[PDB]
Short mmCIF file of C-alpha atoms in Angstrom, two decimals:
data_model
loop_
_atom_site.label_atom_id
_atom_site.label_comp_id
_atom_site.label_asym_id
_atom_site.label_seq_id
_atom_site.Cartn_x
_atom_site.Cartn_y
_atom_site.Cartn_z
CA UNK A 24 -60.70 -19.18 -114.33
CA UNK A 25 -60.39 -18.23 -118.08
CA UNK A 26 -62.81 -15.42 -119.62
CA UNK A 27 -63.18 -15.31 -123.23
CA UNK A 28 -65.82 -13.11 -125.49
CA UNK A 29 -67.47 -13.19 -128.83
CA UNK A 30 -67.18 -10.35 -131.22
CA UNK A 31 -69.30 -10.20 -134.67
CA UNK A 32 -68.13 -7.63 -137.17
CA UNK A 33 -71.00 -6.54 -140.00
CA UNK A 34 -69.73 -5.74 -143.46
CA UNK A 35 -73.25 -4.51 -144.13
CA UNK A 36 -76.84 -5.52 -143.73
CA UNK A 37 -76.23 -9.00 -144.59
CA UNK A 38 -75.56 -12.25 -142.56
CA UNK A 39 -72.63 -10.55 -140.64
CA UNK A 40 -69.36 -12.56 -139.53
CA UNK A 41 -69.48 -13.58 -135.61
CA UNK A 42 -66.07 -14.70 -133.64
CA UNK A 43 -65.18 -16.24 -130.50
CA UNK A 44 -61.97 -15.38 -128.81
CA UNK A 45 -60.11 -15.86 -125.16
CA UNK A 46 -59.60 -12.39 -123.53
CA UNK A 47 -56.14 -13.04 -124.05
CA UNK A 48 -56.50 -13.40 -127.56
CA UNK A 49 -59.02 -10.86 -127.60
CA UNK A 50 -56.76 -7.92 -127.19
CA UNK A 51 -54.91 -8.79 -130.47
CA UNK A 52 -57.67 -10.25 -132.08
CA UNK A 53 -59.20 -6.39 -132.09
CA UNK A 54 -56.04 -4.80 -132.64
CA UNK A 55 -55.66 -7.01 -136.04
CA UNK A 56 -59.08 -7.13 -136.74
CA UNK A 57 -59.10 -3.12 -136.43
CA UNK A 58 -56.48 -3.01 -139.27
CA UNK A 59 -57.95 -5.20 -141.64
CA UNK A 60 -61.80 -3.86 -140.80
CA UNK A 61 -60.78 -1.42 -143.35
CA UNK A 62 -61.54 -3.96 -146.00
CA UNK A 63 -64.96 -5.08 -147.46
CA UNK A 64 -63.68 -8.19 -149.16
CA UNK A 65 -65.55 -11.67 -147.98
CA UNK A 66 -62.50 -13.62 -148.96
CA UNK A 67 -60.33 -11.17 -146.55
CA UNK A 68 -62.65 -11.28 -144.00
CA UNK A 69 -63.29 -15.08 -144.04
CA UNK A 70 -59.55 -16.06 -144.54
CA UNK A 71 -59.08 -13.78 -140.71
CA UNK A 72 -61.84 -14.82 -138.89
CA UNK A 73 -61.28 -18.12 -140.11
CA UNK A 74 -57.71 -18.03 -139.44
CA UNK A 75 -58.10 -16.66 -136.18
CA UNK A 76 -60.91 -18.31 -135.18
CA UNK A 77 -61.30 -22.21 -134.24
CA UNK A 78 -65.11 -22.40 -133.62
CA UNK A 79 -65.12 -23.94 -129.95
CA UNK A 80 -66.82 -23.53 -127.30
CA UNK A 81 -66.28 -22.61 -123.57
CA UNK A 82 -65.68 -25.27 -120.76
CA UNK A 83 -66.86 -26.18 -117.30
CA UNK A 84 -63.46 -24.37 -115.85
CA UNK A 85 -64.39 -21.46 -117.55
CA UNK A 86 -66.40 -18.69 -118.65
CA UNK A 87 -67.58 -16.31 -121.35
CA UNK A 88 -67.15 -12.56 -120.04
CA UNK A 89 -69.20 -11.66 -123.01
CA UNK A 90 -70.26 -10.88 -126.67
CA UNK A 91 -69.67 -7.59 -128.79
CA UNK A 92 -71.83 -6.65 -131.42
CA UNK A 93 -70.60 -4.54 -134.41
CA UNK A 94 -71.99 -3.73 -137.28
CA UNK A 95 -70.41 -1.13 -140.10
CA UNK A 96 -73.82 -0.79 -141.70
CA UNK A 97 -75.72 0.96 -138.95
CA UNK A 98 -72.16 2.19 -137.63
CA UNK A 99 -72.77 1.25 -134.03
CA UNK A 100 -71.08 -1.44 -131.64
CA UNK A 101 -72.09 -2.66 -128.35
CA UNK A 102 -70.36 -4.70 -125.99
CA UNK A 103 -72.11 -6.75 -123.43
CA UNK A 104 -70.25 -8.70 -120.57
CA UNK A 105 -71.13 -10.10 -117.55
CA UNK A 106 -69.53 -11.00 -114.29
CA UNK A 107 -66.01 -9.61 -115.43
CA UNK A 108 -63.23 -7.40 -113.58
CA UNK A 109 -61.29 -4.26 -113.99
CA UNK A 110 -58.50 -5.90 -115.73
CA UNK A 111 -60.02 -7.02 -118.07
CA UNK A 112 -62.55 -4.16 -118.38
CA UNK A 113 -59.65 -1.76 -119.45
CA UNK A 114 -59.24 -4.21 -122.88
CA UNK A 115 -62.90 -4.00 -123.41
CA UNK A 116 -63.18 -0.39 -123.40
CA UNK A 117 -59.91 0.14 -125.24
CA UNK A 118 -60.81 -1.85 -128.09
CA UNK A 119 -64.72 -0.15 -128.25
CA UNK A 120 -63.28 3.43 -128.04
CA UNK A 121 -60.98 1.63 -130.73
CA UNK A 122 -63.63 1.96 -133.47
CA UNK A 123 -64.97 4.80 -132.17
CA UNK A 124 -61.57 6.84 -133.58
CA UNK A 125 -62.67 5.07 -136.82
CA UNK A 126 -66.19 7.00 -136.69
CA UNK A 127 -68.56 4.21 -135.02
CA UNK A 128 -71.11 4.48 -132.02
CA UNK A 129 -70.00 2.32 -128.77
CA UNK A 130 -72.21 1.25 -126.44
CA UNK A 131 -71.67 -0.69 -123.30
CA UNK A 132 -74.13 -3.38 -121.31
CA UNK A 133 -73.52 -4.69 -118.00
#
């Protein structure tokens, strides 16, 4: 079956910006989204999620591993997933301790 998951990144304490990716697409999703998280522009930030999102949903043949919630204006990130494997585990924790290098909490639920 396919797992996909649902990041939301927080440019402050306003209506923050909420994505949902495959786990495939995940992995490079974060890596990009890393890079231009630098920013604080809503026209950069809408033009990538935008562009790499496609607002859908999930089907019957598959699942959502999970969500991960990040926000830069408390400085924390959580990432909650459920029924998931190693493989795919490794991705999840690489991309939290990602932001962590940046200066961010992460926090994981399971």
């Amino acid at each position: 079956m396919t797992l996909c998951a649902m990041y939301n990144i927080s440019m402050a304490g306003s209506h923050p910006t909420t994505i949902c990716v495959v786990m495939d697409r995940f992995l490079e999703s974060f890596s990009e989204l890393y890079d231009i998280i630098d920013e604080n522009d809503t026209d950069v930030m809408m033009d990538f999620i935008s562009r790499f999102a496609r607002t859908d949903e999930i089907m019957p043949e598959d699942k959502t591993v999970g969500f991960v919630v990040v926000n830069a204006d408390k400085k924390l990130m959580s990432v909650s997933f459920s029924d998931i494997d190693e493989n795919m585990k490794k991705v999840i924790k690489a991309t939290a301790e990602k932001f962590k290098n940046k200066g961010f909490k992460v926090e994981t639920d399971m």
